[PDB]
């Protein structure tokens, strides 16, 4: 094949708890790899490799971090902060895999 991702990374700005297989769930702060934007043809999602595994993940939740490509290997790390906030995050947009 003669296709390519983006590979650029991204930012969680909130967190999420997934409801579909394919969905990825995360917390405020993870980092993720993003492949590629509106993938499946599902407006504001994206798809993402985040612990180890692949699917997708609202945008907007996220911030997208361009940059070089590294030729050594990345090593992110995170704890499991307590919140204490009743500040909700933006919804995550529609899943509906063709037209509305």
């Known amino acids: 094949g003669s296709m390519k991702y983006l590979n650029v990374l991204a930012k969680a700005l909130y967190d999420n708890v997934a409801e579909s297989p394919d969905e990825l769930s995360f917390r405020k702060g ?3 790899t993003v492949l590629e934007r509106d993938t499946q043809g599902l407006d504001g999602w994206w798809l993402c490799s985040l ?16 940059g070089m490509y590294d030729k050594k290997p ?20 529609p899943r509906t895999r063709s037209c509305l």
């Open 51 to 66: 612990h180890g595994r692949q699917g997708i993940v609202p945008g907007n939740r996220l911030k997208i971090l361009v």
């Open 30 to 32: 993870d980092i993720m």
């Open 74 to 93: 990345a090593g992110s790390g995170g704890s499991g902060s307590g919140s204490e906030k009743q500040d909700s995050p933006p919804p995550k947009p």
